[model samples]
Target: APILGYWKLRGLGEPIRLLLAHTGQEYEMKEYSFGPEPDYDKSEWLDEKFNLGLDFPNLPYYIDEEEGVKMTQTVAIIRYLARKHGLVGESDEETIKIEMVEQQAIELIFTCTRTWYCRDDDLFDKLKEEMMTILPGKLIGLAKFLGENQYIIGDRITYVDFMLYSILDYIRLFEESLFDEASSLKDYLTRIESLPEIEKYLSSDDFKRFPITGPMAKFGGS
Candidate 1:
C-alpha cells in the first residue's frame, strides 16, 4: 500500500492520520514542515506515476497501491480511507445518517478556516465575531444531539465520530475557550479521547510527532 504523505503541523492532514491510527493500519507518515509544503515535490520519489497533478492544479491527493489511482479532495480521501478501513457504519442507513454529520462538520470547518485562519486582523476578527456567535449555538445543538451517547452512532465507533471528534479537538486547539463556553463538550471530548485504542494511539509516537497546538497546546494539553 502507498503510504500517506501529509504535513505534520497542518490541520488538514491530521484527520487522515487519526483514521489510519484508529484502524491500526501500518503505513508510512511523511511529515512535512509548515511552509512550501514539502510533500508536493514530485521529484523526490522514484516512481512519479502516482503524482496527483501538483504542477498543474494541485491539491492534497493520495495514491493507492493496487490501481495506482490518484485522487484528491479531502472528502474523497477521507471517505475512501473510511470505507476501506471499515471505520464507517455497519449498515447503509447508518452510513447515510452519519455521512450527513460528516458533511456538516466539514462545512463548519471550512467556515472556520476561511474566516479565521486565512484572513487578516479586521476581517478575521469580524468573521470570528460571527463564528463565536454562530458556532457556540451550533455546538450546543450538536452536544444535545450527541448527549450521553457512547459514540455519535451509539455504542460502536464510526468514522463520523472520529471526524467530528477530531474536528472538535482541532477547534479546541484553536480556542480552548470554545469548549469552556460549552461545558458539556469537555466531558464529550474526554469520552472520545479516552477510548482504549484511541488512548493507546495518543501516547504513541504518531500523536507525539504532530503535537496538537493552538488552544489545545495551552489549556487542553494533557
Candidate 2:
C-alpha cells in the first residue's frame, strides 16, 4: 500500500484522494492537524518533513515503499500515480492534451487558495471580487475545451478530470454563480460526481468535506 502525507484539510490532497477513490486504490493517510488559534502550529508536518528522504519535502507527498518511491509535490505525486494506473492516456496526442488541462486546473486551484487563505478582511473581499470577475472567463474556457466530450481529453476519463473536479468543486462552493452562467460546467460537475466509484467515495464516511483550504484560511475552514 502507498502512504500519503498532508495536512488534515482537503486542499491539494483532496484530488489525490479522489483519484485513489476513483481507481479503488487502497492507501494510507497521515493527516497532520494544525494547532489552536494564535500560532496555528504545523509542527506535525514540519517535524517529519526532512526525515522522509524526499528530495523536495513538502505537504501532499506520496510514499510507496514497495516501489522504492518516496516523493513530494502534489502535481508530481498525482502524475506518478496517473502513470502507474494508466490514467494518462493511450496516445501521445492525448497525453499532451491531458497535461495541458492538468496544469490549467492546477493553476485554478492555486489562484483560489491564494485568494481565500489571507488574514486581512479587506484584502479578502478585494480578492473575492477579483476572483468573481475573473473566474467565469476561465470557466468559459474550460467549457469550450470540454465541449461535447464526456471527459477532459476525450470520452475516456483521465487524471485531469480529477484535477478539474477538485478545483471546480472549490470554485462552485465559493460561489455557485460562477457555474450559473455556464450550464455546461455544471453538467460536467454532475457528470464527474455521478461516476459510480466517485459518488460512492463522496457519500462515504471517509470523505472529508469541511476545511477544504486549511485552519488558517479566512474561509473554507470549519
User: Could you estimate the TM-score for every candidate?
Assistant: 0.77, 0.96
lDDT at 128, model 2: 87
lDDT of 1 by residue, 1-222 (tens): 765655345466667766777788776665443323323343434244354554322234566666565565667778888888877888888887788788878877777766644326787778878888888877887788677777777887777777787778767766778777676677776887787777887777646533442222222222
Off by over 4 Å in 2: none
Report model 1's TM-score to 2 decimal places.
0.77
Scored by lDDT, model 2 comes in at: 0.87
Best by TM-score: 2
Residue 36, model 1: Cα distance from true site in angstroms = 8.0
What is the C-alpha lDDT profile of model 2 across 167-189, one tens digit per residue?
89888888887888888888888
Q: Give the candidate number with the greatest lDDT.
A: 2
Q: lDDT, candidate 1, residue 54?
A: 40
